[PDB]
Amino acid sequence: MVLSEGEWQLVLHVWAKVEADVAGHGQDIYIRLFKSHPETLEKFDRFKHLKTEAEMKASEDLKKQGVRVLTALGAILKKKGHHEAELKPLAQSHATKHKIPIKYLEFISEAIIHVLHSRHPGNFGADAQGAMNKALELFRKDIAAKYKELGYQG
């Protein structure tokens, strides 16, 4: 697939607002993911013992993971589809070391959309949500193709 320049502008306009508070958005996204799909917490050996949302909000390690994820995804989105070099190392660690199935990438995509809709309603109307969903679908299609080349395709 291919996004138009106008679709990319809608994605990067709301992403510029996310970048005013990377750690806060990272925390909100991972807490939404763990509350909605609790099985995903099991992939994190450092904080898989957390039992409540209060514990998750106080976790320094969870906050650091949110910042690493959003910094990497922000770099991929700022390439506007020319992200082959960025995806290679991410695909290799997620297929071979962490073993993250494509369905968990779909789950965190839903969590990003929910958080952006809650925090940025004025910059995340229907057209902007549609563009963000297309950008995340492109990212998941390209990572799934790299998973297959690497021997995982999960």
Ligand code: HEM
């Ligand atoms: C937007 C999608 C995602 C991006 C851009 C992303 C990016 C990253 C980055 C940059 C790292 C550190 C470098 C590395 O190990 O490759 C990382 C580590 C990790 N990610 Fe992902 N990630 C994403 C989704 C997920 C999801 C959905 C899960 C699990 C449900 C996950 C599980 C992990 C784990 C377990 C680690 C290692 C954590 C540690 O160091 O303790 N990732 N991710």
